[PDB]
């Protein structure tokens, strides 16, 4: 007998548990909401986790963005690392990126080399085993080789590899002679990744000496960013004279960026579709409140003001919304994939090994809050229509 | 009273200005089938486009027959090309190296495709802007010109360009790097993507530059399936030498494979939830609005030709509602999927962000292609959904005692 | 003697042990063809539930109800529907009409469901509505009807298909004296002509006294049994 | 003196064009304090519609119904609710209870809506039930209640608030003689002590003769207007 007019709403919610099955269709109003919330939470969580996995495992080994020289060589005091100002910039380093060709004792292949400073937080130092962490000393001319490329070329430690760069060539009557030099590998860099088949790690000083660059001249400044979404919009930032912006969206590895744009577009499409399905299932409670015309008319006969009926049905809708939201969060977190990995052995072709799930708390909170707000807001026109009809409940 | 005396009761479920409750069932089915159509067509368009980015161009995944002067490849070619799952097989030269251009060197993959097999077992002439077939004839050894060379080359019709072989041979000797006098035989104004990462070389020069005879490099495959391609290629290589094993290639685009699996699973687990929503709406409509009607109808029921006359009434009710909803939703889904509105900004002025037009407005993006077979699948599943969601409440209400009319 | 209904030891105790209410306990009925029966009694005396159990509309906890020799409890659903559409005509305590069907259709529903000829169905439904008193109010939906005329629609519905038993749960509660007298005149005429047996529950003592047999429900027991001849 | 309810020129014709059936035509009532008033008429003559209309529960096509001087049609929703919660007690023709609430809560809803203390709310609801005859019947939901018990719960619901005016649509239609006598006795006691006035539609002639004022409502007209002294 709580004197706040929410007693009748609670009694409507818990009531009519008559034959062990009527209660199921009674709670169907919040079951639809909890299923919609479960869908939205699992979609956003899986998308966020898979995006995080792709941004880390693939994109932390290759350069993220590069700032170089628009004309001629690159002059460092124009804009050093400390002066590197951009939107969303996280990590700054110097680097040289070069398309090179490697000749081994078996065959000749191509690839890219990244000249870095070993004194920094190299993402390959943990992967450099059987060898010193900074064995690529300036002038030592030691280049560390990966796993896939070494296995394909049939080359072991201690061998001499002819590394050549096509940019620095010279005229000769017998053809074109580019800048070629023999380097000794001391071991392997088992990166245990995809890029290790064509990516090479080199010192920055010897690389700078390789392309006949003047003293202190490097190829570019490498920026490890924080988000891959704003990459398209941040191509017109503050890049002064003597520099230009390049990145992995269209220069190199553009297939990843194209598939990411397509995946984002279809993700927003599916999110819109699930949202309109959620709207169609809030119409379920919108008609559920309209199903209790007799009760609302009896209460209005009892002298209960129409605004108080609005409050009653709004509170019923809000209770349904909060129950649905908390159960949706519970089954999106505790039952994302944490129960026997959905038993993928069934003939539905399920892949249980791929679980890129990351339950973002902010997203689940905002989704649940929007679900609750919609669940209360959708009992405003039905309730006003119910209270607008006088107690003419002659079973119309 | 065979055809008329049974749909009458279900057709009288309109009431007096209370039909606005069963219309949430027609709309519930229409929206469900429309979003199903949009999702399935969009997924099919995604699959078609992605299959044009993996296998249609740069076919990845094949048994690399590594051999010196390979020659008896005809037997294996004939034994493998006709196995189930393989569309066609064609030998190509998958070389890599450097090409001279304006006293500069460009690192490029040499794709020595076969002009004899070009028209039949490749789509190279079908993808061009359109030219005479004699322009792609062999012997004269015309190669495609690229922007990165033509920018500083100024090569036109009648100009001959020199190409020097990279001489990336095991022999320390130069061995006369093949010198090719290529001739410009056409021009393209489509895109530079085909002019930067692709090249074509006649087979004679490719064979001469290898310091051997008719040494084939690769035998590429064009297929229609990629999911089962792993074991299929493994078994196709099982008829090859056992001492030469094959390293798996799953890891290159295993993440794109997982992307496809993820989008498929997400679509399915959201659309079965739309299915559940439609079933929920119909059961809610038929449990409360009409249950004492079933009560007193069972109080005064028919002879008994079919025990579920109430079940038949609600079967006709659900069939009518679901059929009209399915037709409307199919029309909506097809019209929205086939093309977007000419002007998108006009409708979405009241976007709710108080911002002009749309910041994320896209033109000819989100490609989608319709499969009418999927339309029939969604139609059948929606009708079965409505039939079950109208029959089960009917069966629940019929079997309970008519003394549940007051409760 | 006992022909049309033989109800034996029918006991109805709702709910479970240590809290069951004796709403019906050891009711015995011997209803013959054409027997004029009136059930009278106070409140919660178990009169509506007795009708629901005799009509097979509910499941008695104990005892049995035997209709035309064949028990109703053991009978199949199709034959139950046959009885309910050819032998049993039920008037509920309330209207319990179909709100989507007009009054004419609401009284023709037993015939439209019994698979009869439509021209016969409409003509006999109109005749029954004229006999009950709704000549001008035949095409009105129950939502546009009053309590008394809805009750008259229900009474007509229980007489349209010419039942052998007509169970009536307060057919005169929502009616004045004139319409009550008229409806009992219809009941007496159907008893004289069609032979239909009317098993009616009323609270008005005069209307029950105008009928041949009286039974008194009190404490779930049958007390008053008055026979003149 | 005629103060409480002054209904004049009340008419109701709200239906599809041409078929528009009129049910009332220029009906006028003068109900004062303690006027123990009854309406008698044949079914379908416009009695329940008249009370649903003068109670403010429906919208009249024409005429004025004024309660304590203030007209209901010109009045807002909040004050209408205040009147219905403090001055008007309505007994519907059928049960029209809340199926979700037990008998005691269905009786005490007016008190709960009146923002009253629950400690005396339960006591008053129990007092009304023990007066009517349902002290043991308070724990049953309406779905487990009978027609007579439902009507008695509705009567208790309209009488707990001690309203000045209590409209009744067949308060004893589904009740036996003893319960009807007891309920009209309680009606008289409340009229004599609490000063409440009852506007009761009934068909039982003797219960109407127990009433102080009797009007006959038929075919949209008030025919009988009898005063003894
Ligand atoms: N929309 C409507 N509003 C009011 N009355 C209507 C309406 N439509 C039809 N009517 C008719 O007008 C009559 C209204 O009078 P009403 O007061 O309902 O009869 P009544 O007095 O209830 N008879 P009883 O049941 O014995 O009390 C009904 O019998 C209907 O047939
Ligand atoms: N399922 C149930 N649960 C609890 N109580 C029940 C149930 N069914 C019936 N009752 C009670 O048992 C009695 C049933 O008798 P019933 O014949 O319905 O009375 P009634 O004569 O129809 N009402 P009335 O004649 O207007 O006074 C009532 O007191 C009901 O409240
Ligand atoms: Mg009435
Ligand atoms: Mg009764």
Author numbering:
A (entry chain C): 2 to 397
B (entry chain E): 6 to 412
C (entry chain F), D (entry chain D): 2 to 230
Which lines from the publication concern this structure?
Lipoproteins in gram-negative bacteria are sorted to the outer membrane (OM) via the localization of lipoproteins (Lol) export pathway. Among them, LolCDE, an IM-embedded ATP-binding cassette (ABC) transporter initiates lipoprotein sorting by selectively extracting OM-destined lipoproteins from the outer leaflet of the IM and transfers them to LolA, a periplasmic chaperone. Here, we report cryo-EM structures of LolCDE in apo, lipoprotein-bound, and AMPPNP-bound states at a resolution of 3.5 to 4.2 Å. Our studies snapshot 3 functional states of LolCDE in a transport cycle, providing deep insights into the mechanisms that underlie LolCDE-mediated lipoprotein sorting in E. coli.
